[PDB]
Amino acid sequence: MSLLKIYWRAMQYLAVERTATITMCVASVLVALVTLAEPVLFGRVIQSISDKGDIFSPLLMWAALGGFNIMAAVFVARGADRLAHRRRLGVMIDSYERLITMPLAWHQKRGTSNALHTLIRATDSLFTLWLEFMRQHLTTVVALATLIPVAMTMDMRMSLVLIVLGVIYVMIGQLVMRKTKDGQAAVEKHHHKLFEHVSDTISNVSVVQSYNRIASETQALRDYAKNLENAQFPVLNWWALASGLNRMASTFSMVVVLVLGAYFVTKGQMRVGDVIAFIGFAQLMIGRLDQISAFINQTVTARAKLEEFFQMEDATADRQEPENVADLNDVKGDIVFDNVTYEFPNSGQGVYDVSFEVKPGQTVAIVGPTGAGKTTLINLLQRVFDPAAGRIMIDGTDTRTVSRRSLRHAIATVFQDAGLFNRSVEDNIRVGRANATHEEVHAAAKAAAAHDFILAKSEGYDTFVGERGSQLSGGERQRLAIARAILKDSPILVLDEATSALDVETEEKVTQAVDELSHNRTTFIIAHRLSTVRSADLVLFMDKGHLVESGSFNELAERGGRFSDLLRAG
Amino acid sequence: MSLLKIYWRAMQYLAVERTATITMCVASVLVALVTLAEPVLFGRVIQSISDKGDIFSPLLMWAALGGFNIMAAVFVARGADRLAHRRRLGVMIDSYERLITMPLAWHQKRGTSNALHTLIRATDSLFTLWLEFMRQHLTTVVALATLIPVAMTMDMRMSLVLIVLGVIYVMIGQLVMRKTKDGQAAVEKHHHKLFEHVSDTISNVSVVQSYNRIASETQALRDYAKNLENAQFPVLNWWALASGLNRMASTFSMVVVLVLGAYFVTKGQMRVGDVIAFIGFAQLMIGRLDQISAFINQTVTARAKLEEFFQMEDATADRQEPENVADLNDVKGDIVFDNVTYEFPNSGQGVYDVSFEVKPGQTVAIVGPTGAGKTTLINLLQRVFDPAAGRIMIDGTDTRTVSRRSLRHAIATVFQDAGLFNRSVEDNIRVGRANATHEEVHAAAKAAAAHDFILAKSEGYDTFVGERGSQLSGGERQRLAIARAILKDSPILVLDEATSALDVETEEKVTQAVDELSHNRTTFIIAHRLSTVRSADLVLFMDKGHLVESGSFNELAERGGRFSDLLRAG
């Protein structure tokens, strides 16, 4: 019963918008009633006592219903697509704004690309469902459900005939659909083999021509083509049947209905109008059955993505209860970690009960080998994930009782692989401040030594950098990220391998600038280059989940053995 | 008149296969005649003197035509797609085998990827054209062209009415199509802007969340959505009209025809059957006009690719006249170049009248800086492009009078970026010999020191390497190419920067193996690594299109000044 559940949950979204949905559904009901009423009036016009009598009276009604059908076919078709577009945009906006504001750990668990693809494809399929369903298939469903009583009360024998014809047509349609799907699934493998071979051999034309392999490649292609012919032969009959079934069924239904009508009229139990009515009934029944069968197929195909979308929306629906928690204000800087421990891959906890203190105006440099616990410590400093054990204290206030909107503002962190939007370089720089202006941007660029690089080259400081910074090299991206970070000028600052892809000449000036800008601020520095560490005030050693050394630059000469090994190494 | 020309040139390909095309066209003509004849017989059945008289006689004929229509709808639909598939495969095979055997210079001029895409897309569009045209639109064209005389002779007033209705419907269809295309072209830009923004901001979720930019991004998305709503508002009416026009026209035509029929019958100048016939005539005319208009739109869209395909096929149609030219046999090796000169980019000829001699059993190493004339010389050795000036002599026979199938076999050349198929590594190695066997493959791999690397790792020597060798590193690809070249063991051999991506340890053994295997053969070696040149017998210096030095390793110590500079440099 998954199909009906997804139909209901897709109709709930339309039920969010009540007025337009009510207008569309009542319009569809009226269109269905007119669609049923038209053939009866056509039969009334045609019968008209042979054709001798009053023709004007039924003809006027028939023309009026025809004009109403024209106007409704315009109005319903316009309203349905307007509603579908508006609802798809609203749903996409709501899902996006609920998805973007939710922790990263879920993004790494699922995959941001996967979430984006799910959202886009599911919204497109849902829009198609909304657009087609309301108008055409609400009309068809109501039309058939109301047509059953009319045939039941008019010409019971032909009512049973129509029901039998519809059932047989639907069953044959399902059979053809299944046996065509099987054949297509069988053929696709040979098709893909053929075209992959063609592409691979054409791309490497030089190798083929250099070894006199033209004859062999042509023979292989002919063999693959013969394989396709053999694989396609069994399914040609079903392909032809799928192509022709609609006209087959229309002609067969018309023939059966007309033959029975003539047989009954010859016996005097029926009249011409009741036959002209049932011919139209059969024709419209066949057409609408075909349409709704195609719709059901499309929905069955799209169910796989729709269930995933609904699962993601249900999962990404609730966060912590909103409240005006006591956010830290006038942050000065004193960071203590006590007994903190976390399990990153749900097993094999990295950090083992680390504890340390960071004083005002002091810079801390963390160094280690293959141990990944320093990155986990940095993440805990930003409070990416709440620690299962241990505590973090800043300014005498618990980090767990501080609003994220203030904690994010209080710390500026630049890491190894900075990301840039596909906007202009000025726009990318501008995100440091909420408002900012055009004045201090140049000063920040000069401080990061990016103003000179971006002024003349790359067509001024307004060019559109490629996606994920694909139009610039790693050094330029790192310089831009440094400029953004120093423009943010948060009192708490973090470097994480953001200066590991540049030569010494610019590295020295970048380090000098970031140190001068951080004289009054506290910074956490992590890097594999043992050149910016010599200017630090407190060096910490992070090895295999443990902290073993805590001291200044002048006290680490004789402190630690492995640390001494690293110091003598470089 | 381009459209009719492409239609004619697309029908020529079907005209290649005569019997099946004749059967399909005569079947389509019969189907069209039956389609026209059916409404007249329906009117005959309905009229039947009110409905009092002989009903069996017309009803039997009508049922017979219905059954024939069913059988024809199956048979024609099957035959059309069988023919279309066979013809598309044949055309693709012919075009591929004519394209793959033609010089590279055209491939670089156009682009092998572009040629492949043109061929595939054009063949797909041509197959769709063949499949739809024959059955459905040959039936429609013949049906309308024959329907005009029938209406002309039956009920001239209604013939004129039908012609007017058809003309008006086609004109309104064209208007709606144009005004929908304009709106879609206007909307696409805002649509793409919206979705590009969504993708860019979701991908960089960490940056957005780290700077409290969620509100700004949501506001920007809402602004883009409002822009889409504003851009889509003007075209909703035309979208609704395009959706509804078919039912609009069907209902309007039926209403007009029935009203005129009742008006004429009231005056006694017409009968019921002639009205029931014209209602069906109008219905089928509307349906077939819609179908053929959609077909014309599709063909107009596909013309852009079809003209390019025809241009490429005409260009890639003729080569030099086939002949049993005197191919060189029992090649021993003595290569002389005299006064050869070529213009690569049609301007600024690289090589300037070079002349040199290469003796049996002697290896020649060509060295140079930024000069690209050495690569042109190598290409001329393989006779990639015929020299405009100068001559090349081998074995006392002109290279211009030697078959390519022998010249390619006589020389084995491995260059900087070797290409490998997406087959197994064994299959890639096997192309050295036409037949070969599984025995000497292992010996060749051992000689190239690739057997040990490929035996245990990468799941034996049968794994499917990725496209263009994407599953292996540059060193492994170079080793595989060396193995293939030494398996070919041609008496003339060429290295072109095929050992410039490996460390010294394997480089020394690779050079030793290739030198030992080339003791009895003549080789041309080009590389930027000045380590394999010390074992050469004749070193040539190629600078800015000129040859200035010609001597052995022992005579180049005091020969040349710039060459001496390169020698002392490395």
UniProtKB/Swiss-Prot annotation, chains A, B:
Coiled coil regions, renumbered to chain: none
Major site of localization recorded for this protein: membrane
EC number per UniProt: 7.5.2.3
Domain of life: Bacteria
Enzyme class, first EC level, given as a word: translocase
TM regions (residue ranges): 22-42, 55-75, 156-176, 248-268, 276-296
Alphabetical keyword list: ATP-binding, Cell inner membrane, Cell membrane, Membrane, Nucleotide-binding, Sugar transport, Translocase, Transmembrane, Transmembrane helix, Transport
ABC transmembrane type-1 domain mapped to chain residues: 21-301
Molecular function as annotated in GO: ABC-type beta-glucan transporter activity; ATP binding; ATP hydrolysis activity; ATPase-coupled lipid transmembrane transporter activity
Subcellular localization(s) per the UniProt record: Cell inner membrane
Signal peptide bounds: none
Reactions mediated catalytically: [(1->2)-beta-D-glucosyl](n)(in) + ATP + H2O = [(1->2)-beta-D-glucosyl](n)(out) + ADP + phosphate + H(+)
Binding of ATP, residues: G368, P369, T370, G371, A372, G373, K374, T375
Residues of the ABC transporter domain: 335-569
GO cellular component terms given for this protein: plasma membrane
Keyword Cell membrane: yes
Topological category with respect to the lipid bilayer: Multi-pass membrane protein
Any one Pfam family match given in the protein's UniProt record, by short name: ABC_tran
Assembly and interaction partners: Homodimer.
Family membership: Belongs to the ABC transporter superfamily. Beta-(1-->2)glucan exporter (TC 3.A.1.108.1) family.
Biological role stated in the UniProt entry: Involved in beta-(1-->2)glucan export. Its export to the periplasmic space is required to exert its action as a virulence factor. Transmembrane domains (TMD) form a pore in the inner membrane and the ATP-binding domain (NBD) is responsible for energy generation.
Comment on protein domains: In NdvA the ATP-binding domain (NBD) and the transmembrane domain (TMD) are fused.
Protein name (record): Beta-(1-->2)glucan export ATP-binding/permease protein NdvA
